[PDB]
Amino acid sequence: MVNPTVFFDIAVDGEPLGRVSFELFADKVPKTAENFRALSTGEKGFGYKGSSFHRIIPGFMCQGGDFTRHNGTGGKSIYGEKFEDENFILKHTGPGILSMANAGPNTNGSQFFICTAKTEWLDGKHVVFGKVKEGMNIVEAMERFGSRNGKTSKKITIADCGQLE
Amino acid sequence: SMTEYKLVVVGACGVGKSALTIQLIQNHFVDEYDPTIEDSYRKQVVIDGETSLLDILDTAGQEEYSAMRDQYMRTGEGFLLVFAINNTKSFEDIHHYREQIKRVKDSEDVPMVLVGNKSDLPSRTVDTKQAQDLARSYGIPFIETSAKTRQGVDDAFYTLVREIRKHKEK
Numbered sequence: 606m607v608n609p610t611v612f613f614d615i616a617v618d619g620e621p622l623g624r625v626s627f628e629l630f631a632d633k634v635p636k637t638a639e640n641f642r643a644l645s646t647g648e649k650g651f652g653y654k655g656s657s658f659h660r661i662i663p664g665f666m667c668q669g670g671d672f673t674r675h676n677g678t679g680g681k682s683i684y685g686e687k688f689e690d691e692n693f694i695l696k697h698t699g700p701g702i703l704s705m706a707n708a709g710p711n712t713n714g715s716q717f718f719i720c721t722a723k724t725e726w727l728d729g730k731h732v733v734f735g736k737v738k739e740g741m742n743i744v745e746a747m748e749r750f751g752s753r754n755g756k757t758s759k760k761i762t763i764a765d766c767g768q769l770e
Numbered sequence: 771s772m773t774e775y776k777l778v779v780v781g782a783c784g785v786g787k788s789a790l791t792i793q794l795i796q797n798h799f800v801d802e803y804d805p806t807i808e809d810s811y812r813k814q815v816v817i818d819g820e821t822s823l824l825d826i827l828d829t830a831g832q833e834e835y836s837a838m839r840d841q842y843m844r845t846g847e848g849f850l851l852v853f854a855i856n857n858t859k860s861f862e863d864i865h866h867y868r869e870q871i872k873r874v875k876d877s878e879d880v881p882m883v884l885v886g887n888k889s890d891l892p893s894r895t896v897d898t899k900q901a902q903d904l905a906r907s908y909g910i911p912f913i914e915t916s917a918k919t920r921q922g923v924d925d926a927f928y929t930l931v932r933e934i935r936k937h938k939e940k
């Protein structure tokens with residue numbers, strides 16, 4: 606019944622930066638939470654490990670999760686290439702919110718973003734399904750490698766990831 | 771002497787705004803799609819014997835950030851309205867871009883060129899005549915381009931520069 610928590614070991618050009626952990630709201634967004642959980646453990650044979658935070662814009666978000674094309678255009682879910690927007694119960698209320706990236710309605714794959722501020726204009730358009738538990742200071746550090754067009758000044762990767770007990 | 775122009779490239783996502791700009795600036799093309807947030811380029815060129823600095827704002831094809839969009843249109847001196855010849859929705863969007871520019875500029879006379887890109891591809895869905903007729907109805911130039919083969923790339927940007935030059939000196 607307790608929501609699962611997953612961890613991301615972040616690296617900068619391969620050197621450890623720190624750990625971010627997330628609570629996944631399986632209680633209210635179960636299909637979307639389960640996708641992220643399974644992509645974090647790699648149990649389906651694919652997932653986040655090794656992939657980059659390719660788009661980081663200070664004041665807004667850190668976005669990642671393209672493990673199929675490695676170029677910001679790819680990713681896939683455990684349910685197929687895309688899955689529908691599950692619900693819009695939860696909102697982009699402030700720093701640390703974890704939400705699905707998309708290319709319009711019902712196009713959730715694997716890409717996701719971590720808010721570094723309130724992004725309320727995305728409410729009702731992007732499915733919020735978790736939040737940072739520990740390591741907001743690591744997210745703030747990741748944000749410093751971003752820029753106005755999202756390009757990062759060093760390679761920010763998920764060197765390891767998995768599910769916590 | 772010299773002049774300088776603020777050119778803005780607009781159009782639906784994926785139509786080739788960045789590919790056209792990169793061909794003009796850097797003289798190469800790649801198949802890989804790198805979706806734009808916002809990029810700016812500067813290049814000195816000679817057009818009809820007159821040297822100019824081109825400042826090119828390469829915008830994202832997106833319909834969610836109207837305040838930013840409007841500022842791009844407020845500052846821009848001329849606009850490339852880009853669609854892809856194999857993307858019917860992108861052509862249907864063209865009139866929205868023109869309406870938005872006229873709204874922001876509060877004017878019916880704003881330098882712009884209609885660009886039908888990806889002319890190399892054999893998957894056309896938009897007829898050349900339909901684009902010609904639309905541009906004629908607006909009183910603006912129309913050019914078909916391919917960022918892949920470079921057909922029409924210089925002509926599209928230089929035609930826009932000529933539209934601005936005329937507007938300024940008339």
Ligand SMILES: *CCC(=O)N1CC[C@H](C(=O)N(C)[C@H](C(=O)N[C@H]2Cc3cc(O)cc(c3)-c3ccc4c(c3)c(c(-c3cccnc3[C@H](C)OC)n4CC)CC(C)(C)COC(=O)[C@@H]3CCCN(N3)C2=O)C(C)C)C1
Nearest residue numbers: 662665677678706707708716718783805807808830835838
């Ligand atoms: C027609 C679009 C389309 O179909 N596409 C297919 C490929 C591509 C695409 O959707 N993907 C690669 C998604 C993806 O990454 N989705 C993104 C949404 C997205 C996608 C793209 O390509 C661009 C933008 C958003 C975009 C473009 C310009 C932006 C912009 C976002 C923001 C701003 C902005 C607004 C106000 C003030 N300042 C700015 C910036 C700083 O000024 C330069 N601009 C300029 C107008 C908003 C943000 C918050 C700053 C950045 O937002 C994002 O990057 C969003 C945040 C939520 C999660 N995102 N990205 C997505 O889901 C892949 C998942 C396949 C296009």
Ligand SMILES: Nc1nc2c(ncn2[C@@H]2O[C@H](COP(=O)(O)OP(=O)(O)NP(=O)(O)O)[C@@H](O)[C@H]2O)c(=O)[nH]1
Nearest residue numbers: 783784785786787788789801806831888916917918
């Ligand atoms: N065959 C062909 N492909 C093209 C042409 N122009 C662009 N492309 C391809 O179309 C895709 C999208 O091009 P791009 O320039 O990134 O489009 P954009 O309008 O800048 N997209 P965005 O709004 O997301 O920034 C890329 O795969 C690119 O190689 C063209 O003239 N011919």
Ligand SMILES: [Cl-]
Nearest residue numbers: 727832834835
């Ligand atoms: Cl967005």
